[PDB]
Design a binder for these strands. Structure first.
Length: 123
DNA sequence: AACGTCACGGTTGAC
DNA sequence: TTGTCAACCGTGACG
């Protein structure tokens, strides 16, 4: 649902500014226009202008960050939780040792056991 | 008067 | 299939 900000600029709460506006903020910055002017001219909150400008400097892109989705779980299951729970053995507790404890405890099978390398990555 | 930073109420999508 | 949840969003306000 489209809404209006204090400066009279249209925006959708939760969603990124449309590309046409993002593109314009950057064009203006390249023209030597001060950020505060871009704010009043385009009617975008200055906090937003600042963000988009700082991001263009870091990433070199107009496009917004990646929204939504689940981080890839290569080392999937509650197993990950069990590996963190092994915070009592922690120091000295080798990567391969963890794999063995995961098997005799019941949480993991011999066929479905994570490689010690993967556990190193997770730990 | 300019602008860096962040809580807030919000939406999204990979698994 | 439907739902969970951590990633991001822009505004508005503070310093």
């Amino acid at each position: 649902q489209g809404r209006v900000n204090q400066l009279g600029g249209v925006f959708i709460n939760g969603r990124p500014l449309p590309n046409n506006i993002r593109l314009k903020i950057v064009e203006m910055a390249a023209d030597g226009i001060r950020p505060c002017v871009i704010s009043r001219q385009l009617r975008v909150s200055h906090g937003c202008v600042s963000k988009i400008l700082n991001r263009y400097q870091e990433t070199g892109s107009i496009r917004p960050g990646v929204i939504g989705g689940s981080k890839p779980r290569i080392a999937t299951p509650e197993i990950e939780n069990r590996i963190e729970e092994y915070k009592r053995s922690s120091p000295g507790m080798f990567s391969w040792e963890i794999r063995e404890k995961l098997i005799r405890e019941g949480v993991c099978d011999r066929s479905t056991a994570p490689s010690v390398s993967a556990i190193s990555r997770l730990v």
